[PDB]
Enzyme design. Structure first.
Site, short mmCIF file in Angstrom:
data_model
loop_
_atom_site.label_atom_id
_atom_site.label_comp_id
_atom_site.label_asym_id
_atom_site.label_seq_id
_atom_site.Cartn_x
_atom_site.Cartn_y
_atom_site.Cartn_z
N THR A 173 0.84 -1.23 0.00
CA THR A 173 0.00 0.00 0.00
C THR A 173 0.86 1.25 0.00
O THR A 173 1.88 1.32 0.68
CB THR A 173 -0.95 0.04 1.22
OG1 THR A 173 -1.91 -1.01 1.11
CG2 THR A 173 -1.69 1.38 1.31
N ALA A 221 -8.57 -2.80 5.60
CA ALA A 221 -9.44 -2.15 4.62
C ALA A 221 -10.85 -1.96 5.17
O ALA A 221 -11.48 -0.92 4.94
CB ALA A 221 -9.49 -2.97 3.34
#
Ligand SMILES: [Mg+2]
Ligand SMILES: [Mg+2]
Ligand SMILES: [Mg+2]
Ligand SMILES: [Mg+2]
EC number: 3.4.25.1
Lengths: 195, 222, 204, 233, 226, 212, 125, 196, 195, 196
Positions: F1, F49
């Site tokens: 990420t 998430a």
């Protein structure tokens, strides 16, 4: 030890290594030279576990100097790096492995080419245009990936190196007390005394 | 020490077409190296033109499907028999999953249907409720075997037009339901060959504006 | 921590009609950090090709070891080693480190110079031979490769068709693995010509 | 969270053309000690259902009481308790499966593996499994514990798929079940020779057989076996 | 893995499945688990595959040398004693679980051996993850004084039980029959009940589909003359 | 990420990658790591998430209730603090979040708050979060100026994610760009890293280490 | 005890002769005749079974020995020396080749291994 | 496992069950736990099958070499060799062995060698997991100088109960009789001993 | 957070607090103000676990501001420090304790005296002429023990503080990115914008 | 501990040793493990002394309150109350209890409640650490409808062997006889039972 950087430009290899030596709570020294000259045109910087770093570096230095005297000949940077890799690859399955990561910057006088080899303590060798060990690459590689050219001059290499060190000084939590910078080219090894 | 979780194997696959959607899954249920059942349905018609599968730990999977079916029932009660749209069902399932954020449903959930424009839709969930609308998604044991194949044969990844040598991509032409079903069958046939938890049978649920249809195919039983 | 997934990488080998193919990615990393995009994992000793995945120091070490051994083989035997014989040498050499093994996943590929028969083989880290007719896979994306190879592969492919099949198997498998990619090489091997092609792929 | 103390081993079952068969031995083990030799682990519910239970016996006795209470409760204000509104195998199973999953979700499971065997109102065969995790599944043959590993392979040779069920008679099915129980006695160290067997048929109803024994055992060949390799005498 | 050994009238038969696995992944769909120690002494191995092969070849090598030294055909008890003493020494770290069968001047023999060095004698044996499925079949159909044909049938049926019911076992059945006063007959892929069905589609690509950066000829030939 | 957000003359640039991994396995290359809290507020996804999706969607509901009750746009300060106070209640339970709450109001101007699951709430000009954050910081730090144009700022954010996507194994897929103005955010497209890399390499002359 | 003969028993004489090797060859000369002939599709090796006594069963004494399935050996000279060399040759075919390459050694290399063993008995202590 | 050895008037009898388990799975239901280390010196094995087989094979080798040099060894000598292996390698062994033998001078003798490697000469001995359940029965029913038939009945009844309660024990009851007359093997099947 | 220093001179209290905020690998900020004004003549600096520091500081600030409004009166530094100590002493036996160390610098308008209180996360309170938390005292106290006088001016206090920071910058391994310095006296609280 | 309860013709007899250990130290050599929960419903306790005393006291309270409302409880009812406590609190208890009682309608009954909290109605029951050694003896020697004197002998002999082999068991053998005639306490000393 902490930050060791390397960059291979047109006609030379530049190694930058931090000056700090920290033993836990205190910074014991701020002028430490984390490098050894293996031969007139080959320099090795190092970082890893205390004691093992210098012990390994001086052991390699002694061996290359022995070879140089026996044959009256300087081994190529490639040959030296292969010798070093084998020693580390041997070491990783020893009773107590050398926890030492190295960069080998050499100028090949036969091919008239600078060469930079990155070898970690496992004996993982790669030839690179620029390299680092530890977290140094995480901060610097995005800058090197952008600006690097294979036809860079030594001066341009030093300027790109300054930008890398500046980014390290900004975003790294540890104070590594600046870097000692050394250049390896056809004339041998010299230290940049103002950086 | 008591372990409240288990692994019942299984592999599921959801593909969204232009005006249809399929949700497929093998019918084999396992624990360790034993087969519990060669035919234990894993993909369900949940009403309102929605199909669902919660793959992984079958007890949690059955519980989640049961709760969602119940949510559809109460949606009708509370909102004048309004049809639950696929996007609304997806958000609802997120909340069902996240409600057990600190003792999760050990499953990978996929739902399929049509959106409010009549286009094919597939939604994919992680065990704790994070979700996304996707075109293609495999879940479960052999997901790592199937998805690369789907990237290549559905989205034409790494495929270029001959003669151009990498300059022009293979254009993304729409696939028919018959074409999709071929890829699904070949995906599961391949997965059955190389994954020990996959086999026995393949049940596919196809969703169109006309409703939900089923197709069943045998798979190798070894 | 897991030695077989520190550096990352993959190798795949296939058989075709009077040909074999072996391919690999070019990535070397330190876990999340990409270090090199030129770390080829396929080597050759005469007409016998060896791909090696796993811990990169062992990959390098084993290449040097098999070069050493095949060079002596040639001097004594007065002939180049064959794929079948070399396969046994790899198995022997790996098992001799049974309780301190090299963390690798080797793959042999080649054509027997006398019979003309295509040959591939795979090993686990301690020498167990997998001699498949169709394909052999190895690496951090081996699951992905098994899925690609199982569906894309068909027997008796011509050299130029086999190239497309193995290339697409590697490429799409590598793109679903974080620790594989950064370039790729494919070898197409015939009885007396070998072509080496570098593929264009995404660099993330 | 607990550990099972007094335990019961395999429960095995299968479907045949007109109904289902279920069986389980009469042992209550205490680790390696074969402590209790008269334990009934098949519990009939009405005349259409038999619940076979393995695992923790104290939890089995609790479940046995729940089922007994279920019958009492169903009869309350129910004029058709012995007719249209009698308990079905499917009702009994769903109730147990609900309890098992609830208990595992409180991290206090009933340490059991259960098979509910029966015949529905419309004559359909019912055979479904549930365990301490709340995991459920159905199959033409079902077995718990060791039976899953040794009985299922044998029973699946008779009924390999759904289409084999109408072709399978009660005589063939019972024969297969009885042989499987013999095989388990040979090979399961926590099994006993004594067992119970129940048949639920859509025509002849519930037949409950107690005090059955494993018979026709092969042991004679043991006399020729000497040493562990080189010994001749 | 499913492997069985069955004694019969004038010999012994050994059988195995052909699936080799890497966890839940099938590495090889047609593995050869039947190994030769000597011409008429064969064994089948379960557990760590490299260990079962290494230990068979080592004892097979020493058995061959012993046969030459003694001018006698090798015995099954010799292979067994050599195997167990080797395995015992390594305290179960060599994960070889074998069923050893063969014929020699003494007669026909059937043994099992476990990684720690314990051995067992029997008329019928099974080993591997499918051993319980296989033994259920053996315990149901085995009898004394089996014929060669009955034993091959029983053995292959026992492997089939593992193939269908054990996830660790699959694909084909290999058999080897060792009869007294005869050559041992190795029947590779004696049964083939798991051929893959034709795919719905051909995945042969158009030539030029893959993007290429560079091409070059690889010099496999030695340094040339002139 | 890899996620970033930086303040500049023309507002805020938000740039994220699109990759999601489970170990070495690339689960998705099409993940939306910018959460559209509302037409004026954006949030970045890093950590778990679900935690980011769920609580930043919830945040949008709280921001909507605020403006219904107070008849006024919620401040970035107040919006970010609603989230940080919430996750602080859960501290110790296991939430994993690293986000930048980005907005542009009259009273504040362009504002970014780094909010984090151990309770941290930091106002700042440049933030970078994720496994590839160090790579992105390098490009950002050396090229950032307050007086960047919207066009150049958008490119800088795009180029910084690319830098990370190249070197970081767990970053890649595609780049999502956003430009946050006082009248709301504006989406500036999805950019495949594969195609973007080669394009940037040629046009910029960078990545000479890579053969193309 | 201990083998205290750590020095060579074969040494060069002033004339450059290695006496013990010459004398070993003399012992070979006294030995029974053996021969070998190579054909296009085979090789033959042969010798006389010089039976020391008619009561002896000369079939139990093998002068021609299998070394590998495709290699055989015959000798002239001292029989016992031959017998132990056959044992060593059979073993070395496995230890230094078959256990490494999974196949039997080619004739020339097995010969080379036997030759090495005989050379060492000419220089070792 | 349930094993025992009992001295009686004419010599000694060894007894054993035939069950070998791997957890709850019976890996062998017809095991022979009565092993011969010399013509009339046998042993009953309990513990690790690998260990007890390895030990017994070594002892058999030692007594074979002893016999070649010094003639027939005593039962005490055999027990000593067992003990020496079990005691010196106690850290790496899990073996509980009962040694039984017949001399003409000493007649029937029984030695038990438990886990530690100690030796105990006894009139009779019981060992194995199933022995725990028959300590009371055997102590109450054993008599010295029993007949062959009485001793067979004593062992049959004892091991019958051991098998009844111990899940690790079962199968057939094997017995070996050691007297001046020679060596006799006996076997008793479930249908026989279960009804006792 | 890292370094927080305090020194009470003749007529004022001076608090110095580092500017760095480091989240593991990267320095996220280099201008962080680790302090809250509790009342016009009372300042509190803080360091400890992330999140808890600011949460605790703002919670205290809210409470003192509430008291100020209710009574139309500013609590003495002693009274504020006692309130803060009790909150931390309460917190240490809670389900999840505030891991926060504070310095409270206040000017008592009644007594016309500066006051410095050091309180750790356990609720350990001491009134000191100079104080610190963490490792800061290990480097600085030997200098303060030597040079400190109770009759020092504010300017002399700042000079002694500079010497302390210089020693920290020399011997500490971490780069804390300098300090923000604030002065508390009879006229209230002000920040020294060049240090 | 060695405890047992045996039904016979005229009712039931409970038996127990008197040894209570803390490791190898005998903390009490004259313990009374036969406890009264009602006039003719007693129990034998094994496991945690604290737990089994606490349980028995609660049961005694329950049956006292039962009796006040509904009259004399059955032995089955007493066992049910024991079971309910042992089963519902299985995580926090270490108790193995045998319940024995005499009704006029049902006569002598014995219920054993092992660790899990299960109930098993049996003709006779044995429990405690020493019971392991007498499974074989008790199974071979128990008969239904024995006389009082035979049952006393059976218990005396059984516990004699349990005490002989189990270090955790010893002291005196206490017994309680439950019949229509009433409640009789018996005691047997070491010099009596050791010579059996
Ligand atoms: Mg399969
Ligand atoms: Mg990749
Ligand atoms: Mg990447
Ligand atoms: Mg038994």
């Amino acid at each position: 030890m902490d930050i060791i950087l390397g960059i291979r430009v047109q006609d030379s290899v530049i190694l930058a290594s931090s000056k700090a030596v920290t033993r836990g709570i205190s910074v014991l020294k701020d002028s430490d030279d984390k490098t050894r000259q293996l031969s007139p045109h080959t320099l090795m910087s190092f970082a890893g576990e205390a004691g093992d770093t210098v012990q390994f570096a001086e052991y390699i230095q002694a061996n290359i100097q022995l070879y140089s005297i026996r044959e009256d000949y300087e081994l190529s940077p490639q040959a030296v790096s292969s010798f070093v890799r084998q020693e580390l690859a041997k070491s990783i399955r020893s009773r107590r492995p050398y926890q030492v990561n190295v960069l080998i910057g050499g100028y090949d006088k036969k091919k008239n080419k600078p060469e930079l080899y990155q070898i970690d303590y496992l004996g993982t060798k790669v030839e690179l245009p620029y390299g680092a060990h530890g977290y140094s690459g995480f901060y610097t590689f995005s800058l090197l990936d952008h600006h690097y050219r294979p036809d860079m001059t030594t001066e341009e290499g030093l300027d790109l190196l300054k930008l890398c060190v500046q980014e390290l000084e900004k975003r790294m939590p540890m104070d590594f007390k600046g870097v000692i910078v050394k250049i390896v080219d056809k004339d041998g090894i010299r230290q940049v005394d103002d950086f | 020490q008591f372990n409240p979780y288990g692994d019942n194997g299984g592999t599921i696959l959801g593909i969204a077409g232009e005006d249809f959607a399929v949700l497929a899954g093998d019918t084999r249920n396992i624990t360790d190296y034993s087969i519990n059942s060669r035919y234990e349905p894993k993909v369900f018609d949940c009403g309102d033109n929605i199909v669902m599968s919660a793959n992984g730990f079958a007890a949690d999977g059955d519980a989640l499907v049961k709760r969602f079916k119940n949510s559809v029932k109460w949606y009708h009660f509370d909102h004048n028999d309004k049809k639950l749209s696929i996007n609304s069902a997806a958000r609802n399932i997120q909340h069902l999953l996240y409600g057990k954020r600190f003792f999760p449903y050990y499953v990978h959930t996929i739902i399929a249907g049509l959106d409010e424009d009549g286009k094919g839709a597939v939604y994919s969930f992680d065990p704790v409720g994070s979700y996304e609308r996707e075109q293609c998604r495999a879940g479960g044991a052999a997901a790592s075997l199937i998805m690369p194949f789907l990237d290549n044969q559905v989205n034409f990844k790494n495929q270029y037009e001959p003669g151009t040598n990498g300059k022009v991509k293979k254009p993304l032409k729409y696939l028919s339901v018959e074409e999709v079903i071929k890829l699904v069958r070949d995906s599961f046939t391949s997965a059955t060959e190389r994954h020990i938890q996959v086999g026995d049978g393949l049940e596919i649920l196809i969703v169109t504006k006309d409703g939900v249809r089923k197709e069943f195919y045998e798979l190798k039983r070894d | 921590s897991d030695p077989s997934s520190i550096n990352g990488g993959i190798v795949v080998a296939m058989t075709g009609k009077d040909c074999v193919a072996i391919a690999c990615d070019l990535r070397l990393g330190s876990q999340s950090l990409g270090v090199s995009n030129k770390f080829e994992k396929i080597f050759h000793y005469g007409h016998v090709f060896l791909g090696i995945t796993g811990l990169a120091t062992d990959v390098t070490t084993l290449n040097e070891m098999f070069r050493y051994k095949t060079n002596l083989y040639k001097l004594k035997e007065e002939r180049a080693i064959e794929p079948e014989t070399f396969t046994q040498l790899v198995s022997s050499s790996l098992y001799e480190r049974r309780f301190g093994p090299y963390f690798v996943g080797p793959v042999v590929a080649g054509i027997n110079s006398k019979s003309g028969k295509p040959f591939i083989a795979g090993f686990d880290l301690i020498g167990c031979i997998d001699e498949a007719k169709d394909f052999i896979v190895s690496g951090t994306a081996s699951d992905q490769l098994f899925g690609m190879c199982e569906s894309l592969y068909e027997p008796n492919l011509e050299p130029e068709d086999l190239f497309e099949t193995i290339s697409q198997a590697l490429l799409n498998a590598a793109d679903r693995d974080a620790l594989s990619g950064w370039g790729a090489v494919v070898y197409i091997i015939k009885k007396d010509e070998v072509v080496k092609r570098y593929l264009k792929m995404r660099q993330d | 969270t607990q550990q099972p103390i007094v335990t019961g081993t395999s429960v095995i079952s299968m479907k045949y053309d007109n109904g289902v068969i279920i069986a389980a031995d009469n042992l209550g083990s205490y680790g390696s000690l074969l402590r209790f030799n008269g334990v009934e682990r098949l519990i009939p519910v009405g005349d259409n259902t038999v619940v076979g239970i393995s695992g923790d016996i104290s939890d089995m006795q609790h479940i046995e009481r729940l089922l007994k209470d279920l019958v009492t409760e169903n009869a309350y204000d129910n004029p058709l308790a012995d007719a249209e509104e009698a308990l079905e195998p499917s009702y009994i199973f769903e109730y147990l499966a609900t309890v098992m999953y609830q208990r595992r979700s409180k991290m206090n499971p009933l340490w059991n593996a259960i098979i509910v065997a029966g015949v529905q109102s419309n004559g359909d065969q019912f055979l479904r499994y549930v365990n301490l995790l709340g995991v459920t599944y159905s199959s033409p043959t079902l077995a718990t514990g060791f039976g899953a590993h040794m009985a299922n392979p044998l029973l699946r040779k008779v009924v390999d798929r759904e289409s084999d069920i109408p072709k399978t008679t009660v005589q063939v099915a019972e024969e297969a079940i009885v042989n499987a129980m013999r095989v388990l006695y040979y090979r399961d160290a926590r099994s006993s020779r004594n067992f119970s067997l129940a048949i639920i048929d859509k025509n002849t109803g519930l037949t409950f057989k107690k005090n059955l024994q494993v018979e026709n055992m092969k042991w004679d060949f043991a006399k020729d076996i000497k040493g562990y390799g080189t010994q001749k005498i | 893995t499913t492997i069985v050994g069955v004694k019969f009238n004038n010999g012994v038969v050994i059988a195995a499945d052909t699936r080799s696995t890497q966890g839940p992944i099938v590495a090889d769909k047609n593995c050869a688990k039947l190994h030769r120690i000597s011409p008429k002494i064969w064994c089948a191995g379960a557990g760590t595959a490299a260990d079962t092969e290494a230990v068979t070849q080592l004892i097979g090598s020493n058995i061959e040398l012993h046969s030459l030294y003694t001018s006698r055909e090798p015995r099954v008890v010799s292979a067994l004693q050599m195997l167990k003493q080797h395995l015992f020494k390594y305290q179960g770290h060599i994960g070889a679980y074998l069923i050893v069968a063969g014929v020699d001047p003494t007669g026909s023999h059937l043994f099992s051996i476990h990684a720690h060095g314990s051995t067992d004698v029997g008329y019928y044996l099974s080993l591997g993850s499918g051993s319980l499925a296989a033994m259920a079949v053996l315990e149901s159909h085995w009898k004394q004084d089996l014929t060669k044909e009955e034993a091959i049938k029983l053995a292959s049926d026992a492997i089939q039980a593992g193939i269908w019911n054990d996830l660790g076992s699959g694909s084909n059945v290999d058999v080897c029959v060792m009869e007294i006063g005869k050559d041992a007959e190795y029947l590779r892929n004696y049964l083939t009940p798991n051929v893959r069905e034709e795919k719905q589609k051909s995945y042969k690509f158009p030539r030029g589909t893959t993007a290429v950066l560079k091409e070059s000829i690889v010099n496999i030939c030695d340094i040339q003359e002139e | 990420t890899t996620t970033l957000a930086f303040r500049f003359q023309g507002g805020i640039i938000v740039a994220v990658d699109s990759r999601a991994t489970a170990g070495n396995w690339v689960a998705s290359q099409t993940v939306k790591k910018v959460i559209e809290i509302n037409p004026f507020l954006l949030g970045t996804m890093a950590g778990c998430a679900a935690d980011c999706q769920f609580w930043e969607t919830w945040l949008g509901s709280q921001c909507r209730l605020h403006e219904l009750r107070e008849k006024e746009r919620i401040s970035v300060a107040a919006a970010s603090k609603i989230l940080s106070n919430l996750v602080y209640q859960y501290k110790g339970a296991g939430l994993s979040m690293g986000t930048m709450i980005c907005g542009y109001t009259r009273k504040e101007g362009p504002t970014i708050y780094y909010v984090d699951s151990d309770g941290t709430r930091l106002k700042g000009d440049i933030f970078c979060v994720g496994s590839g954050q160090t790579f992105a910081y390098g490009v950002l730090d050396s090229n950032y100026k307050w007086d960047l144009s919207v066009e150049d700022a958008l490119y800088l954010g795009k180029r910084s994610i690319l830098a990370a996507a190249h070197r970081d194994a767990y970053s890649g897929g595609s780049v999502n760009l956003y430009h946050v103005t006082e009248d709301g955010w504006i989406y500036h497209g999805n950019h495949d890293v594969g195609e973007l890399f080669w394009k940037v390499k040629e046009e910029e002359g960078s990545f000479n280490n890579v053969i193309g | 005890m201990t083998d205290r003969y750590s020095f060579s028993l074969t040494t060069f004489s002033p004339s450059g002769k290695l006496g013990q090797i010459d004398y070993a060859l003399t012992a070979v000369k006294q030995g029974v005749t053996s021969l070998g002939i190579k054909a296009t599709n085979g090789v033959v090796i042969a010798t006389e079974k010089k039976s020391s006594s008619p009561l002896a069963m000369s079939e139990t004494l093998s002068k021609v020995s299998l070394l590998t399935p495709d290699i055989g050996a015959v000798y002239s000279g001292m029989g016992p020396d031959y017998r132990v060399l056959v044992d060593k040759s059979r073993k070395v075919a496995h230890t230094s080749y078959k256990r490494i390459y999974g196949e039997y050694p080619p004739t020339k290399l097995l010969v080379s291994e036997v030759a090495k063993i005989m050379q060492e008995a000419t220089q070792s202590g | 496992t349930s094993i025992m050895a009992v001295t009686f008037k004419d010599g000694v009898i060894l007894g054993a069950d035939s069950r070998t388990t791997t957890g709850a799975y019976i890996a062998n239901r017809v095991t022979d736990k009565l092993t011969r280390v010399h013509d009339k010196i046998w042993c009953c094995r309990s513990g690790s099958a690998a260990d007890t087989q390895a030990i017994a094979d070594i002892v058999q080798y030692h007594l074979e070499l002893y016999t070649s040099q010094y003639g027939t060894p005593s039962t005490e000598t055999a027990a000593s060799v067992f003990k020496e292996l079990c005691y010196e390698n106690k850290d790496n062994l899990t073996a509980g062995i009962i040694v039984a033998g017949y001399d003409d001078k000493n007649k029937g003798e029984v030695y038990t060698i438990p886990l530690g490697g100690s030796v105990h000469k006894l009139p009779y001995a019981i060992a194995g997991s199933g022995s725990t359940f028959i300590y009371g029965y055997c102590d109450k029913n054993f008599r010295e100088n029993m007949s062959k038939e009485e001793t067979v009945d004593f062992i049959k009844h004892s091991l019958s109960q051991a098998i009844k309660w111990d899940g690790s024990s079962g199968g057939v009851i094997r017995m070996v009789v050691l007297t001046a007359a020679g060596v006799e093997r006996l076997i008793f099947y479930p249908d026989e001993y279960e009804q006792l």
